[PDB]
Design a protein around this nucleic acid. Structure first.
Length: 113
RNA sequence: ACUGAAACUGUAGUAGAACCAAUCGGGGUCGUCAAUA
């Protein structure tokens, strides 16, 4: 089945990425913005630079240069798990327990988490 | 019912001044998929 509402519709227009120079939120000013939908960009007011490691032997060679630990499974996020990614309110409150999956992206008064 | 002759369209003059190839982005991470018996 398909849920009835697309997740973009469960996000408020004031929380979506900014579409114009006048709707720049704090991080869009501090870190800057480029409009993904048209003209409009802003150079960020915050620049990170001069990263230096202090420790010379900072890297854990696990024993030999050829050793390698196999690293769990980093799976892809699956927002289809509406009980994990969907919120019962635009306050971000979780879905209620015990309801069937169709409850998920179900009403416009639902929110994203 | 006696051709005028002779005469450099040339001389001077910087396609140039100003303009940031640049703005935003963690090499990141979980549950789905199939439909019957």
């Amino acid at each position: 089945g398909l849920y009835e509402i697309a997740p973009v519709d469960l996000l408020d227009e004031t929380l979506k990425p900014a579409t114009d120079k006048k709707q720049l939120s704090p991080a869009d000013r501090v870190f800057g913005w480029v409009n993904q939908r048209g003209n409009g960009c802003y150079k960020g007011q915050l620049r990170i630079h001069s990263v230096t490691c202090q420790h010379d032997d900072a890297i854990d060679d696990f024993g030999n240069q050829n050793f390698s630990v196999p690293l769990a499974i980093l799976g892809q996020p699956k927002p289809e798990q509406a009980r994990f990614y969907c919120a019962d309110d635009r306050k971000g409150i979780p879905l209620e327990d015990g309801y069937d999956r169709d409850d998920g992206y179900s009403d416009s008064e639902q929110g994203l988490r």
